[PDB]
Amino acid sequence: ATLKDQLIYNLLKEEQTPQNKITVVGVGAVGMACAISILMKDLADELALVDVIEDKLKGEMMDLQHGSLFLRTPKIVSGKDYNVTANSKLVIITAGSRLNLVQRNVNIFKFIIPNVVKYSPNCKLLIVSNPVDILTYVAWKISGFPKNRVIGSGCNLDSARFRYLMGERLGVHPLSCHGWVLGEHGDSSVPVWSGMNVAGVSLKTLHPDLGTDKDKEQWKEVHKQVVESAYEVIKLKGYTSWAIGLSVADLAESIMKNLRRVHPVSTMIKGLYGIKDDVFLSVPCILGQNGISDLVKVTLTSEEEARLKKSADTLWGIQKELQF
Amino acid sequence: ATLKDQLIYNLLKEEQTPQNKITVVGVGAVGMACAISILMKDLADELALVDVIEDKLKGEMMDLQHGSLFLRTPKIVSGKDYNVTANSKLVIITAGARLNLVQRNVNIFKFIIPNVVKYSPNCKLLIVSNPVDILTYVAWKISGFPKNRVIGSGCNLDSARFRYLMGERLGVHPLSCHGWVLGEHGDSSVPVWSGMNVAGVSLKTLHPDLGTDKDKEQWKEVHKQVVESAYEVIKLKGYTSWAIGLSVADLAESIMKNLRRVHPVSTMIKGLYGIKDDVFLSVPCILGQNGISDLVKVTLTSEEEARLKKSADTLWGIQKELQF
Amino acid sequence: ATLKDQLIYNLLKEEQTPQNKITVVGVGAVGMACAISILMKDLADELALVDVIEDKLKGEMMDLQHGSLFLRTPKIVSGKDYNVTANSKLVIITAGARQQEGESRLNLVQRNVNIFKFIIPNVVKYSPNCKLLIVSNPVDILTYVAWKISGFPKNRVIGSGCNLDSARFRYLMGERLGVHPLSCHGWVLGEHGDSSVPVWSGMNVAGVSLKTLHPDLGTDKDKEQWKEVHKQVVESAYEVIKLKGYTSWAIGLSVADLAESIMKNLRRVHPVSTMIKGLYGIKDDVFLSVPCILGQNGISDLVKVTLTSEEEARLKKSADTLWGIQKELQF
Amino acid sequence: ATLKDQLIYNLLKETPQNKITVVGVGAVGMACAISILMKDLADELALVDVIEDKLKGEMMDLQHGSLFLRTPKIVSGKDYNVTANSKLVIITAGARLNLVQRNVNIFKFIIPNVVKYSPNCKLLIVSNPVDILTYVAWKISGFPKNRVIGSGCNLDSARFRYLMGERLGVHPLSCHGWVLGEHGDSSVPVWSGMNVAGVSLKTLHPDLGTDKDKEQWKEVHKQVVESAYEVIKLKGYTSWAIGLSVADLAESIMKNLRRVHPVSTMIKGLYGIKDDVFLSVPCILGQNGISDLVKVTLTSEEEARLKKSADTLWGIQKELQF
Ligand SMILES: NC(=O)c1ccc[n+]([C@@H]2O[C@H](COP(=O)([O-])OP(=O)(O)OC[C@H]3O[C@@H](n4cnc5c(N)ncnc54)[C@H](O)[C@@H]3O)[C@@H](O)[C@H]2O)c1
Ligand SMILES: NC(=O)c1ccc[n+]([C@@H]2O[C@H](COP(=O)([O-])OP(=O)(O)OC[C@H]3O[C@@H](n4cnc5c(N)ncnc54)[C@H](O)[C@@H]3O)[C@@H](O)[C@H]2O)c1
Ligand SMILES: NC(=O)c1ccc[n+]([C@@H]2O[C@H](COP(=O)([O-])OP(=O)(O)OC[C@H]3O[C@@H](n4cnc5c(N)ncnc54)[C@H](O)[C@@H]3O)[C@@H](O)[C@H]2O)c1
Ligand SMILES: NC(=O)c1ccc[n+]([C@@H]2O[C@H](COP(=O)([O-])OP(=O)(O)OC[C@H]3O[C@@H](n4cnc5c(N)ncnc54)[C@H](O)[C@@H]3O)[C@@H](O)[C@H]2O)c1
Ligand SMILES: O=C1O[C@](c2ccsc2)(c2cccc(Nc3ccc(F)cc3)n2)CC(O)=C1Sc1ccccc1Cl
Ligand SMILES: O=C1O[C@](c2ccsc2)(c2cccc(Nc3ccc(F)cc3)n2)CC(O)=C1Sc1ccccc1Cl
Ligand SMILES: O=C1O[C@](c2ccsc2)(c2cccc(Nc3ccc(F)cc3)n2)CC(O)=C1Sc1ccccc1Cl
Ligand SMILES: O=C1O[C@](c2ccsc2)(c2cccc(Nc3ccc(F)cc3)n2)CC(O)=C1Sc1ccccc1Cl
């Protein structure tokens, strides 16, 4: 008899399928930051990692496994083959001319998405890879999943950055500074000035010129500084990781724990704000065990509405010319 | 007249000193992994980051600040000047070249350590930079701090790796697999076979060949795999970050919360195991608000004791020829 | 040599003053619920418990100490003497005397004022630099009492106030909309309890004002009867008392949320009772709930909420009633 | 159109994934509830009792604290339909041979109602005499022994490690020690396993656990027994310590951690014990309940104490009607 048999008496060997499994596809700076944030928040009983670079994939898995003593995630697996991702509740995609840069990530998705749906037909897909709004659509089209199970990170990072900048200007914690950046993720995002508040006190009600070019204090600059901070981080360190990883982990917690919290995420915006094309844009969504179960119908000004419609037309102009 | 003044009525604007401040010196792969693990564990009310590369430093600080909405650390500061580190309770040194490593790192410590003690004379110093055992001694000599306030990461990562491997062989969580790797961090570490247990059941008592060359089960391979895995991770991804960052955060928690938990850390071992020189080696230490307040006197075999004495002689041989 | 000396080599035996100490005064249902919430949220390196009933006090301390293996608070102390509370960063007062049928509201206040005139001087004696968090009812009057007896600046005297009222309101709001209360924003202000004021204009989800979409929100003409959401806050409080005899978990969790902002210097906004003199036409030394920024100095700042004239009149009426009792208080 | 419909556009209006049920909302039950809620172990918490008013009050009080919790649904009821598809069921209902039979009659109604709605659950028995009632739950349910867990010596060990920690000035997490066998007065401290950093205390101090010992380390176990009576005399019941220990068990089960805990299990087949009795041994706890057990090397004296406890428990068990 072995030491294991001399020390431990086994009652049953009958192993079960993972109950709260998360898969992260792409183990770059974003993927690894999502991985550590998820592990530290104790959201999964199993974590699966996938990439094309075999050596860095094995190294990253081993480095996470060596930290098991300080974690509450008993199983960390990795592999090039998607059989390691079987029965995942949530799949996070962070793998990465502009129409050709869209097609560059599109042909990458032509392989990933069918391999993901094959082993986890009932999962929720969380898209992080850029252009997030186009690639969420691509993931939705290739998977054949209903709209609720295909979620784009969208304006989650934009809103988090906005609330941080809002907090700094008012000397208040970002948790107490409410503000929504919607529509197209990145440069063309829309700050919803009417909803910007502290303790239910509307900033536009107190300051009617809020976000307008004629505002003396220039509060519009809070949104400008979101765009500019993103370029600054890239210029200074070459990439963004911690902020995105923490925001993705926040989305994952709502999904995994079925919290039904409202988050600014990219969803099929068809039928809203005069949009008829199959486009994904950020609106506040209620997140839970079925993914996007509901969405908040935000009252937008004519100007905000026009910006959303223009973004939709631009995204459908690229999407129209895509090979599947 | 401002929106801030119209929205917020100020009661007082006297500034207080941070109560639970942590400083991380060196924002490389190790330093950043320590930062994120401390942030996600809510150990500090303020986090300061220091480095020589200004661009990378600003980028890393900004990336952490953009994630504030998902954290409970209201202040994140960075700078080349140590005035940003003022009144830190714990200072974590992860700087240097990732023996010539000794030479380069001593010279680097010659300037870091006096700048640290200048702004935080009452802090605890936690050394991560390699060779961790020599550099903990160097930090102790330059600072002039008492023994208890100078802590080396030492065999904390070695023991965590060992318990992970132990857990995998027995099908038990590493938290329930007890085992101590002591002495010199790295290649020359000592596994304490007599203390290896599950639920107080000694493994060497059940299996006398444990750790011997005549063991058919080859349990001696468990300690060799700790050494092998470290080289494998480096070969595969180029560095180690997550495992070390999580282990350092576990030490930080015991210090910050005054837990008085026992950890394998590098301390002044002069007066134990026939050692008469000023050398730092890993032994189980009680960690709290005063740093190392106490140490556990582990009963070692003649073989284990000889390995510790040999390590001490080698470390002193390098140390006695160093210039301060 | 002892087993301890044979096993452990001591480097230094000197113990530092506690760094993040919390004291809970009154170990009744509320106090104990505040204690377990603070312990489970790891907000303190030291927890001190005080009461007048020595046996119950020792029992409660021992029961908490027996759970130390599952906690991250290395020291739990208790005692009748306030020397156990020395150097506390935050002192939570939950000591009180319940409502007795056949007494005036002034008489009820005075009995609790009698309880405080021993506690407050003993608290400031051992923790002159602490923050005082008052839970005992009538919370608005007793926060004033604590402020007057202590001699502390306004920022270091905090009343629980409308923190439980808002938490209850947001739960009920969440239920109606099928959304988590964290995402359902709403503020109940003024006097804690029966006379609280729901601020309809601030009620929102994702920055979308409910009053803007539905102008009859909080009006008696409302077809959807959203005004009954605030009435259910009042009703649920009486229902809980009728059903189990007291309230503990909800208040303990809300107090822990306040403690977290103070202990960690978060600067989060909370509806807490503060010295409202100089706002909403209130010219008296009264404590009412308004949204306050809470940190290491207690209330460092307050949010100037725009109120309708009827919300302002309700606040002024509450202030007059509280001052009417306060002026007749002997201490 | 309602305000809800004007504000929120519904995509779909389509069961609990990590549900926990607590049976008996007394001091123990409520302490288990708050500990589980604060540890974020369940997405749904179901509460059951016979006293309808107290039950509704306790459920409401927990619901009013939702803003500070990460458990979106708290339900209660006299009917067990509220407990449907629970992953873990915690039984805390009961009196704080004649009395044992009255507690069997209570379990004759609870246990069939629990398995009816949660046939795949893990049963965690807290109610006293915990070792006898664990057997009772196992017999009535028909569940395999891995899915019937008794709290057993989990509180005894926690108390012991606290007392060990106080004597050595070390955190109980770093003070290892196992109290096994029968929960309560007749528990067995395993002196050979008592250690700090893998350093055996019995090796350094041979008199450890004997009357001869000048340092009287045997009092560490005797003060566990004494403290239990003291807490009862002082406050009338024990709640926080037991509630925190149950949440610790619940965490290893819910998250499939495979951590070792001192819990009551079917001990028949070990230490010459032939009768169907449940005693505490270190068990590996996970998603299947007790998947494995640690075979502790016990001295002749310790082994005899377990066998004697088994004979006493069987003596009571054989005379039971159910
Ligand atoms: N949505 C947001 O707010 C947001 C924020 C930041 C970054 N991003 C995006 O996230 C993406 C990842 O950024 P990063 O810095 O981690 O990039 P990176 O180059 O560091 O990592 C990309 C990883 O994807 C892997 N990969 C490539 N092809 C793959 C395939 N076919 N299958 C699996 N893995 C594959 C690569 O091997 C690499 O490890 C980028 O598209 C970036 O624009 C989005
Ligand atoms: N103790 C352990 O168990 C353990 C484990 C892993 C790594 N390490 C050690 O940690 C150290 C850091 O590793 P890494 O991978 O982060 O290296 P890295 O090169 O990625 O980062 C080192 C950082 O230190 C900075 N630095 C250099 N000189 C500095 C100075 N004078 N002041 C401040 N910052 C300065 C560099 O700018 C760089 O950002 C290495 O010495 C490595 O051997 C120790
Ligand atoms: N602010 C709120 O929202 C809110 C909510 C619920 C309850 N409360 C209030 O909290 C208070 C406590 O409620 P409870 O149910 O715990 O009451 P309780 O009677 O159960 O507990 C009161 C405790 O205070 C102790 N005490 C009495 N005099 C004391 C003294 N001089 N020094 C120290 N301790 C002393 C008593 O011994 C008792 O243990 C009540 O006043 C209640 O109205 C406030
Ligand atoms: N295992 C341990 O280490 C340990 C520790 C402490 C207490 N306990 C035991 O836990 C049990 C509970 O103690 P307590 O202080 O909470 O008791 P309590 O009297 O405060 O609570 C018991 C609850 O069970 C309820 N109940 C009674 N019959 C019921 C039924 N048929 N169905 C559902 N609920 C029913 C009662 O209504 C009451 O609410 C006691 O048996 C006690 O001995 C065990
Ligand atoms: O912080 C970020 O870094 C990235 C990045 C770049 C390299 S590595 C990470 C980045 C940074 C700067 C510009 C840029 N242009 C871009 C974005 C999406 C596309 F499809 C194509 C180009 N992209 C990716 C990303 O989306 C953000 S967020 C963000 C980005 C812009 C404004 C506001 C916000 Cl909030
Ligand atoms: O995993 C690690 O990564 C490093 C690393 C990080 C970035 S480049 C290298 C590494 C990995 C492999 C070997 C090596 N040799 C070394 C260690 C300490 C010195 F002073 C000098 C050289 N160093 C550093 C480090 O100490 C560890 S731990 C460890 C290391 C060796 C054996 C066991 C363990 Cl546990
Ligand atoms: O839920 C509660 O329970 C109490 C309680 C706790 C233990 S016995 C009573 C309660 C419940 C009902 C009435 C009442 N009146 C009272 C209590 C003590 C005084 F000195 C003065 C007045 N007090 C105390 C309390 O303030 C709340 S909150 C609340 C209360 C009313 C409306 C809205 C809210 Cl939100
Ligand atoms: O601390 C406790 O409180 C109780 C309690 C709870 C509410 S009223 C009493 C208690 C305390 C004292 C005696 C007793 N009689 C009893 C316990 C177990 C049986 F099987 C049968 C009868 N019961 C219940 C309990 O089990 C413990 S633990 C414990 C108990 C004794 C020794 C060691 C430990 Cl650790």
PDB file of N, CA, C and O in Angstrom, chain C residues 227-262:
ATOM      1  N   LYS C 227     -45.519  56.105  -3.539  1.00  0.00           N
ATOM      2  CA  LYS C 227     -45.472  56.752  -2.228  1.00  0.00           C
ATOM      3  C   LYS C 227     -45.547  55.680  -1.137  1.00  0.00           C
ATOM      4  O   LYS C 227     -44.939  55.838  -0.075  1.00  0.00           O
ATOM      5  N   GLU C 228     -46.260  54.570  -1.425  1.00  0.00           N
ATOM      6  CA  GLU C 228     -46.403  53.440  -0.512  1.00  0.00           C
ATOM      7  C   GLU C 228     -45.096  52.651  -0.318  1.00  0.00           C
ATOM      8  O   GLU C 228     -45.031  51.844   0.608  1.00  0.00           O
ATOM      9  N   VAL C 229     -44.050  52.910  -1.146  1.00  0.00           N
ATOM     10  CA  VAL C 229     -42.723  52.288  -1.016  1.00  0.00           C
ATOM     11  C   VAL C 229     -42.066  52.848   0.264  1.00  0.00           C
ATOM     12  O   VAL C 229     -41.513  52.074   1.043  1.00  0.00           O
ATOM     13  N   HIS C 230     -42.166  54.185   0.491  1.00  0.00           N
ATOM     14  CA  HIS C 230     -41.673  54.823   1.707  1.00  0.00           C
ATOM     15  C   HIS C 230     -42.535  54.436   2.921  1.00  0.00           C
ATOM     16  O   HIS C 230     -41.996  54.268   4.021  1.00  0.00           O
ATOM     17  N   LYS C 231     -43.865  54.308   2.735  1.00  0.00           N
ATOM     18  CA  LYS C 231     -44.770  53.918   3.816  1.00  0.00           C
ATOM     19  C   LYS C 231     -44.484  52.476   4.273  1.00  0.00           C
ATOM     20  O   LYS C 231     -44.595  52.179   5.466  1.00  0.00           O
ATOM     21  N   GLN C 232     -44.056  51.604   3.336  1.00  0.00           N
ATOM     22  CA  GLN C 232     -43.687  50.212   3.612  1.00  0.00           C
ATOM     23  C   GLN C 232     -42.386  50.120   4.436  1.00  0.00           C
ATOM     24  O   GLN C 232     -42.187  49.133   5.132  1.00  0.00           O
ATOM     25  N   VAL C 233     -41.512  51.144   4.353  1.00  0.00           N
ATOM     26  CA  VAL C 233     -40.257  51.247   5.112  1.00  0.00           C
ATOM     27  C   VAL C 233     -40.648  51.365   6.576  1.00  0.00           C
ATOM     28  O   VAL C 233     -40.156  50.608   7.405  1.00  0.00           O
ATOM     29  N   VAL C 234     -41.582  52.274   6.872  1.00  0.00           N
ATOM     30  CA  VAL C 234     -42.128  52.516   8.207  1.00  0.00           C
ATOM     31  C   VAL C 234     -42.863  51.265   8.697  1.00  0.00           C
ATOM     32  O   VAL C 234     -42.548  50.768   9.781  1.00  0.00           O
ATOM     33  N   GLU C 235     -43.781  50.723   7.868  1.00  0.00           N
ATOM     34  CA  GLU C 235     -44.560  49.523   8.168  1.00  0.00           C
ATOM     35  C   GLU C 235     -43.695  48.305   8.468  1.00  0.00           C
ATOM     36  O   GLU C 235     -43.984  47.594   9.436  1.00  0.00           O
ATOM     37  N   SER C 236     -42.643  48.055   7.645  1.00  0.00           N
ATOM     38  CA  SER C 236     -41.750  46.902   7.824  1.00  0.00           C
ATOM     39  C   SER C 236     -41.016  46.939   9.155  1.00  0.00           C
ATOM     40  O   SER C 236     -40.834  45.890   9.758  1.00  0.00           O
ATOM     41  N   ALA C 237     -40.646  48.146   9.633  1.00  0.00           N
ATOM     42  CA  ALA C 237     -39.971  48.342  10.909  1.00  0.00           C
ATOM     43  C   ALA C 237     -40.863  47.867  12.056  1.00  0.00           C
ATOM     44  O   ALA C 237     -40.389  47.127  12.915  1.00  0.00           O
ATOM     45  N   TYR C 238     -42.162  48.233  12.039  1.00  0.00           N
ATOM     46  CA  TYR C 238     -43.132  47.805  13.052  1.00  0.00           C
ATOM     47  C   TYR C 238     -43.429  46.317  12.913  1.00  0.00           C
ATOM     48  O   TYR C 238     -43.627  45.645  13.920  1.00  0.00           O
ATOM     49  N   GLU C 239     -43.446  45.802  11.671  1.00  0.00           N
ATOM     50  CA  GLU C 239     -43.728  44.395  11.408  1.00  0.00           C
ATOM     51  C   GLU C 239     -42.626  43.515  11.990  1.00  0.00           C
ATOM     52  O   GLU C 239     -42.932  42.618  12.765  1.00  0.00           O
ATOM     53  N   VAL C 240     -41.344  43.840  11.704  1.00  0.00           N
ATOM     54  CA  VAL C 240     -40.187  43.113  12.248  1.00  0.00           C
ATOM     55  C   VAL C 240     -40.278  43.027  13.786  1.00  0.00           C
ATOM     56  O   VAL C 240     -40.148  41.929  14.334  1.00  0.00           O
ATOM     57  N   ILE C 241     -40.583  44.159  14.455  1.00  0.00           N
ATOM     58  CA  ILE C 241     -40.736  44.240  15.921  1.00  0.00           C
ATOM     59  C   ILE C 241     -41.858  43.344  16.414  1.00  0.00           C
ATOM     60  O   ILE C 241     -41.660  42.613  17.372  1.00  0.00           O
ATOM     61  N   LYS C 242     -43.007  43.362  15.740  1.00  0.00           N
ATOM     62  CA  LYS C 242     -44.156  42.524  16.092  1.00  0.00           C
ATOM     63  C   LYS C 242     -43.810  41.023  15.940  1.00  0.00           C
ATOM     64  O   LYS C 242     -44.177  40.219  16.797  1.00  0.00           O
ATOM     65  N   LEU C 243     -43.085  40.672  14.860  1.00  0.00           N
ATOM     66  CA  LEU C 243     -42.737  39.303  14.496  1.00  0.00           C
ATOM     67  C   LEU C 243     -41.596  38.674  15.297  1.00  0.00           C
ATOM     68  O   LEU C 243     -41.738  37.515  15.698  1.00  0.00           O
ATOM     69  N   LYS C 244     -40.460  39.382  15.491  1.00  0.00           N
ATOM     70  CA  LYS C 244     -39.323  38.803  16.223  1.00  0.00           C
ATOM     71  C   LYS C 244     -38.964  39.548  17.530  1.00  0.00           C
ATOM     72  O   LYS C 244     -38.165  39.022  18.315  1.00  0.00           O
ATOM     73  N   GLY C 245     -39.561  40.725  17.758  1.00  0.00           N
ATOM     74  CA  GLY C 245     -39.373  41.491  18.987  1.00  0.00           C
ATOM     75  C   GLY C 245     -38.323  42.579  18.971  1.00  0.00           C
ATOM     76  O   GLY C 245     -38.290  43.401  19.891  1.00  0.00           O
ATOM     77  N   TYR C 246     -37.449  42.591  17.943  1.00  0.00           N
ATOM     78  CA  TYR C 246     -36.341  43.553  17.807  1.00  0.00           C
ATOM     79  C   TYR C 246     -35.778  43.499  16.375  1.00  0.00           C
ATOM     80  O   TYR C 246     -36.185  42.647  15.590  1.00  0.00           O
ATOM     81  N   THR C 247     -34.847  44.387  16.043  1.00  0.00           N
ATOM     82  CA  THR C 247     -34.175  44.401  14.737  1.00  0.00           C
ATOM     83  C   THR C 247     -32.672  44.302  14.997  1.00  0.00           C
ATOM     84  O   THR C 247     -32.160  44.969  15.906  1.00  0.00           O
ATOM     85  N   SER C 248     -31.965  43.454  14.252  1.00  0.00           N
ATOM     86  CA  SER C 248     -30.539  43.334  14.524  1.00  0.00           C
ATOM     87  C   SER C 248     -29.649  43.264  13.280  1.00  0.00           C
ATOM     88  O   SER C 248     -28.747  44.094  13.149  1.00  0.00           O
ATOM     89  N   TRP C 249     -29.883  42.285  12.385  1.00  0.00           N
ATOM     90  CA  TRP C 249     -29.034  42.049  11.222  1.00  0.00           C
ATOM     91  C   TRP C 249     -28.911  43.252  10.290  1.00  0.00           C
ATOM     92  O   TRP C 249     -27.790  43.662   9.981  1.00  0.00           O
ATOM     93  N   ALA C 250     -30.047  43.840   9.890  1.00  0.00           N
ATOM     94  CA  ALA C 250     -30.086  44.985   8.983  1.00  0.00           C
ATOM     95  C   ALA C 250     -29.322  46.205   9.533  1.00  0.00           C
ATOM     96  O   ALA C 250     -28.530  46.805   8.806  1.00  0.00           O
ATOM     97  N   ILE C 251     -29.521  46.530  10.824  1.00  0.00           N
ATOM     98  CA  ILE C 251     -28.846  47.662  11.461  1.00  0.00           C
ATOM     99  C   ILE C 251     -27.340  47.390  11.606  1.00  0.00           C
ATOM    100  O   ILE C 251     -26.544  48.259  11.243  1.00  0.00           O
ATOM    101  N   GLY C 252     -26.975  46.181  12.048  1.00  0.00           N
ATOM    102  CA  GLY C 252     -25.585  45.760  12.214  1.00  0.00           C
ATOM    103  C   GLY C 252     -24.781  45.829  10.926  1.00  0.00           C
ATOM    104  O   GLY C 252     -23.642  46.307  10.929  1.00  0.00           O
ATOM    105  N   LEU C 253     -25.391  45.397   9.802  1.00  0.00           N
ATOM    106  CA  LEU C 253     -24.772  45.451   8.485  1.00  0.00           C
ATOM    107  C   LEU C 253     -24.591  46.886   8.006  1.00  0.00           C
ATOM    108  O   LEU C 253     -23.553  47.201   7.419  1.00  0.00           O
ATOM    109  N   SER C 254     -25.585  47.756   8.273  1.00  0.00           N
ATOM    110  CA  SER C 254     -25.518  49.172   7.863  1.00  0.00           C
ATOM    111  C   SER C 254     -24.453  49.949   8.632  1.00  0.00           C
ATOM    112  O   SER C 254     -23.753  50.768   8.042  1.00  0.00           O
ATOM    113  N   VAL C 255     -24.322  49.668   9.937  1.00  0.00           N
ATOM    114  CA  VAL C 255     -23.331  50.282  10.836  1.00  0.00           C
ATOM    115  C   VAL C 255     -21.927  49.879  10.382  1.00  0.00           C
ATOM    116  O   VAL C 255     -21.036  50.735  10.338  1.00  0.00           O
ATOM    117  N   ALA C 256     -21.744  48.588  10.010  1.00  0.00           N
ATOM    118  CA  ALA C 256     -20.480  48.053   9.498  1.00  0.00           C
ATOM    119  C   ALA C 256     -20.070  48.773   8.215  1.00  0.00           C
ATOM    120  O   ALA C 256     -18.880  49.042   8.018  1.00  0.00           O
ATOM    121  N   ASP C 257     -21.056  49.094   7.353  1.00  0.00           N
ATOM    122  CA  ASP C 257     -20.836  49.843   6.115  1.00  0.00           C
ATOM    123  C   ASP C 257     -20.310  51.253   6.414  1.00  0.00           C
ATOM    124  O   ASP C 257     -19.393  51.715   5.732  1.00  0.00           O
ATOM    125  N   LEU C 258     -20.848  51.905   7.468  1.00  0.00           N
ATOM    126  CA  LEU C 258     -20.368  53.223   7.913  1.00  0.00           C
ATOM    127  C   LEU C 258     -18.944  53.085   8.454  1.00  0.00           C
ATOM    128  O   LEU C 258     -18.061  53.837   8.042  1.00  0.00           O
ATOM    129  N   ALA C 259     -18.724  52.093   9.351  1.00  0.00           N
ATOM    130  CA  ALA C 259     -17.431  51.786   9.973  1.00  0.00           C
ATOM    131  C   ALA C 259     -16.337  51.581   8.923  1.00  0.00           C
ATOM    132  O   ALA C 259     -15.230  52.097   9.088  1.00  0.00           O
ATOM    133  N   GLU C 260     -16.668  50.895   7.813  1.00  0.00           N
ATOM    134  CA  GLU C 260     -15.721  50.632   6.731  1.00  0.00           C
ATOM    135  C   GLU C 260     -15.238  51.938   6.092  1.00  0.00           C
ATOM    136  O   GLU C 260     -14.036  52.094   5.895  1.00  0.00           O
ATOM    137  N   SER C 261     -16.159  52.873   5.802  1.00  0.00           N
ATOM    138  CA  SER C 261     -15.785  54.164   5.200  1.00  0.00           C
ATOM    139  C   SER C 261     -14.900  54.985   6.119  1.00  0.00           C
ATOM    140  O   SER C 261     -13.931  55.584   5.645  1.00  0.00           O
ATOM    141  N   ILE C 262     -15.211  54.973   7.435  1.00  0.00           N
ATOM    142  CA  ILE C 262     -14.441  55.683   8.452  1.00  0.00           C
ATOM    143  C   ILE C 262     -13.050  55.059   8.613  1.00  0.00           C
ATOM    144  O   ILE C 262     -12.055  55.762   8.428  1.00  0.00           O
TER     145      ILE C 262
END
